[PDB]
Symmetry: C5
Subunit: 268 residues, 5 copies
């Protein structure tokens, strides 16, 4: 937590306020608590709404990934319930569904999905997927072809084909949703306004408290600053849900969970 | 929580007797800065509790869907296949097993007794062998529906109508699992929890100059309001958690089971 | 009975006025600043709570709105798809009407026996009353009517499905209402707020008297009224199926539903 | 806006407060700002949440009408894509769909729909619709009859019938949604509490401000009153989305847009 | 952001307050901080709710546009999966889908869609689209005709037609959603009340602060002014998500992405 640096900086500003409080009158500068209460409350209100937006975004990201697991579970269930004897098809479709999850992760992380794809799919399909400017989307197309062939071969009717196609649609909404969350952030002018106001507020605060608090200034000023900064920093942690950091989504573990689930449901 | 109130009373008594030595050291605590701090904390508690409440509401909605989806699936089975009571009973057993297994999964308790009560031991072994027992129960229910389809008893259309309900259930399973792995905040909530505590303990020292002897009464009142609101959010954030009220989840599982034995002629007594 | 607490608050103000003399001689001082902090905090919490209570009221109203919608369309489908099956129209409508009234009784915790006998043959009434969820049984019975039309070949699996969907929709309503009936907002929210607001309002004049003196009861009652009004409104909204003023006129709503369904089946009241 | 009357009344209350401030001590009345800050902030908080609720219902009303345009567009699109040669059926259904919109408009406005109906439908149908206690619902039923007849004639299969039947369902949800918004208001106790509280607050305020502000009382008091009154009055205007008031939904314009759209998609 | 003018103007009001504070008594003017704390906090609350509503519009607008990409992707996927050999139909339908996006953008931006339409479609079709008072809707209708013809030719069954028909409706919901956001703005009385109120508050503020702050008045007044003014103007920008401002939707980039996706590899699919 690099929050400690500005807390330390805040302690230093408090010490300056205490020793420089002498020259306050000799300059004509006074700072009371009342105007900073107004400012502080206004900032708290705006921080509240902002964090709310950051929170909703983090939650949606969690929701989208939850849907991958749900839709892939049911698609495999449908394949077993409707075509219990078609395990060759079971394995092929499962490999694509598993590939989709990993490919989505790599896409959001901007990493190379090549190794994971080669572990799951024949090289012909991997080349075919990587040739696309939108590889994760290309993967859905391939899963659709597998289902499409079962339809053409008469193993799936249009009805049962439709039941499985619906699940691919659910995955498509996940892909677009994540892509939307990745390119659209909470707008950058929310963060600038708040960062500029919060930092300036905390550093000016001890100068406004010193008249009332004297020697207790650094303790109370640090308490108030810590409160605003903790709340402000919470938004920063929630804003990067697809990242690698510790408070980011465990996408690797999630992908492993998805793969473990699908191989549990096909006897592998 | 009552303990932190008593601790707050002691801090007030300390504040009263130690207020004497304040000047000869130069330490001052006025109400205005703690008014600022208090209102900000209240605002954050408001928004935090709002998020917690949202999580609680979703958890109940998800569980309501279990009750709804299972009711209609059984209704469809009777309306579409009124004579297939062997199939009725087996599927009902899986749906009931699903609810209890879901409850046990979210509560991290042993589902063995409920499973052995409802299903033949062969399936219980199969379900317990899986790392995802609740999902396996859905898979087994799906097989029952799938077999009726191959026997020609269900068409693809009527199969699809029932298949949708298994989908209404899978979404619930994933939804609860997401709510279970949660919280969202990375235990930054702990900070927030502590912030309220430090505020309540520092409060009497800031009030004593104005309130004097009346300090412990007003200080404990304010503390009670903040601590209560904080603990309420804590309870709402974790609807499936370690220290939670299980009367609803248990009543719901009982309600679901009572309904399905109600819609399959197993109730009342002949 | 909020008027009682307003009158009681006036009395507490008078106590504050007459006892302000002995304030110094006891060692008690009460300033406004700490009570502004406490008061604003409570207002914030009342604000969020009241918002939640309203949402719950709106949802309950929505669910009942869906009953009217789904039942209208089910009857519409029956006439459009099976225009000659008027016996089936009548039986299904009677079940749909029974469903609404039964839902009302379930939410009001009252006896549906009289309404059921007015609408259905006694054999069906007994079957429905025997169930732990009579509304669910009514949906099941309505489902049998559609199911029997399907077995007779009058409905295909597709057209059966279109109607089965409306029964899905009613079930989703039943569960929603049930969820709202069994869930209150958590009690710890009403307990915190009701005790806290009351205690705050009665302690307030003791804190105001030093500034306001004789003007204490007027300002104290105004502030108390604002907080109490907002608090009591939330509790009424929290119980949308209850008897209190701003609750759902469920009886009128069921009458509306029944008149609608008899309008679309050529019957007159 | 009759708020200007209450602002002037507030200026009147301030001048009274100024001239009567003399007799304050001689009566035993003291009024400080602090208790009114508490009350004022509380009122603002409740006004904030209330206005939020009013805005949301206005938004729902607009959404419901948006759905009318969407569902009717696609129903007409479907009729054409599925039955391009059945123009007799096209016109009849379009007239019903247009009548539905106008009938809904008149219903929410509590006005007479007769001319709009007679302009769109043969008198034979109009009397039947007007004879019902629920004319808009009867129009959906009649639109349903047209689709049902196309099915019985074998022009629509059960599947394609179902595709259009779904659109009638969307319209049914709109009708119910609108009716609910019309009969259920934001509860009258939100208006009752807030108007009494806001008005009494604004009139009592100068008496509490005069001790501190004196001659500057009317300016600061009217500003505060204007802020609260404007925000309160905004909520009332939003609470009645189907009304005649300028900031209400342009339902007449919306119905014209719908009619123009459907006749645009039928070569009319 | 023209706030920089009003901030400098606020510095001007502060210097006036400082030099005239002596003459307060000689005029009969008294101004304390307390009433302006009340007024300021009320304004902050209302700004909070307003900005929240504005963001809500921004989020929905972004969602509607996201759906365009999703629905159009799956429609093409379905065409490839169900009719893998009908590439002539693929190309015609894709162009309509691409035309739909650009036409929607121009409609919301009130610009001329002629150039984009001629780039994607034959002139005969362009005139038909331009002849309609609602070109975006006409494009969906034409895309619908393509699907409808494949059905009449026996290439699509009623079932598979329906699967694709559903996606066109999804696009219709986007079109209606955007039009609602475009034709209905937030009520004009939100901008009127708040802009006047915030500005008047910020300029009057230093006159009330000078008694406490003296020489520090311009610094604190501009700080408070920046906070209120920034939040207000951002709200203004987000309320018009289809506008040209910098915190608005990059509609041009979005349409390019949609076109690139559907025309990913000269329309080549496996
Ligand atoms: Zn799903
Ligand atoms: Zn297999
Ligand atoms: Zn990160
Ligand atoms: Zn049975
Ligand atoms: Zn029973
Ligand atoms: Zn419906
Ligand atoms: Zn009939
Ligand atoms: Zn359902
Ligand atoms: Zn639609
Ligand atoms: Zn035509
Ligand atoms: Zn003709
Ligand atoms: Zn008339
Ligand atoms: Zn979609
Ligand atoms: Zn192609
Ligand atoms: Zn000065």
């Amino acid at each position: 937590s690099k929050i400690i640096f500005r807390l330390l900086l805040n302690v230093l500003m408090s010490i300056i306020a205490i020793i420089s409080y002498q020259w306050y009158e000799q300059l004509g500068i006074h700072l009371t608590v009342a105007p900073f209460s107004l400012l502080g409350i206004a900032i708290a209100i705006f921080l509240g709404f902002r964090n709310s937006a950051s929170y909703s975004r983090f939650v949606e990201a969690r929701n989208l990934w939850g849907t991958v697991l749900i839709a892939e579970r049911t698609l495999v269930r449908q394949l077993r319930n409707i075509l219990p004897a078609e395990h060759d098809a079971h394995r092929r479709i499962v490999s694509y569904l598993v590939a989709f999850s990993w490919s989505l992760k790599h896409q959001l992380r901007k990493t190379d999905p090549t190794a994971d794809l080669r572990r799951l799919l024949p090289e012909e399909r991997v080349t075919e997927i990587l040739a696309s400017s939108m590889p994760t989307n290309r993967i859905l197309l391939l899963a659709g072809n597998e289902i499409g062939q079962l339809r053409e071969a008469g193993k799936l009717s249009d009805i049962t084909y439709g039941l499985m196609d619906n699940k691919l649609d659910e995955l498509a909404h996940v892909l677009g949703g994540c892509e939307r969350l990745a390119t659209t952030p909470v707008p950058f002018a929310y963060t600038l306004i708040l960062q500029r106001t919060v930092y300036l507020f905390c550093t000016l605060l001890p100068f406004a408290l010193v008249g009332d608090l004297h020697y207790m200034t650094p303790f109370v000023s640090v308490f108030i600053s810590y409160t605003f900064l903790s709340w402000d920093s919470l938004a920063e942690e929630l804003e990067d849900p697809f990242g690698t950091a510790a408070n980011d989504l465990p996408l690797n573990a999630m992908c492993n969970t998805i793969e473990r689930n699908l191989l549990d449901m096909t006897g592998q």
